Amino acid sequence: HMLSDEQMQIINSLVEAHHKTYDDSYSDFVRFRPPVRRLSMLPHLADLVSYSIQKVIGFAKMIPGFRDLTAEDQIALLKSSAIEIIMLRSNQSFSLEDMSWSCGGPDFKYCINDVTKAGHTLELLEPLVKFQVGLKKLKLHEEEHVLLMAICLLSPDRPGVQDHVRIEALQDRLCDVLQAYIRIQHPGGRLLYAKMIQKLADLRSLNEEHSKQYRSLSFQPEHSMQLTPLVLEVFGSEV
Amino acid sequence: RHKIXXXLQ
């Protein structure tokens, strides 16, 4: 078999959508508040996350058929999934030789001790590194990484989603585009789809832990004041 | 006050 003219247009669009929303140069990073080596890294990492939340919103709008759900469904899927997409998209900067995200600048290389200086503990960070090293080891193609993000975003089993029936449909349409792609275009990926679905379930566990840890950070005015309006709105409890 | 999330529009 092969991919259909319609599934490939999904692939091309998702890929260009990721190309437009993910700057390989990382040059927008100097416009963030600097990184500093309690919670010296919070302003810089809050800035970094707030930026990539904006990118993920841009990615979503270009996912085939996202632009056609209720604006409320769009926001519910974006709020609940943003932190998982960010963890996903970030694999692109995680080098395994360094066990950090090196972002085109030594001021922008984030080791685990950096993220502790932004409020988080190993109960989150160590499962998170293991996720990224497991995901990097899967040596995904670009279309798989990008398909995996769109499938992650289009989960209908998140708090707030209304038209579950339809979100289910479009996510299923991408699961099958992906599954076809791996069968047809990836030599030696006879099990790879299943490895990717497990990575989605990983993401939920870390989302849970981040949420738990974020809530603790965001309930102290000392630290919430260092976040951004976009971060507070998205990772926040307000319905 | 006022959701950033119409950065949908």
Ligand SMILES: C=C1/C(=C\C=C2/CCC[C@]3(C)[C@@H]([C@H](C)CCCC(C)(C)O)CC[C@@H]23)C[C@@H](O)C[C@@H]1O
């Ligand atoms: C973002 C992206 C990048 C790295 C993601 C990282 C590295 C630093 C530490 C991060 C940001 C984790 C932190 C636990 C996030 C904490 C957020 C907060 C402190 C506000 O609760 C989550 C993802 C990790 C760089 C580039 O990949 C853009 C991408 O998009």
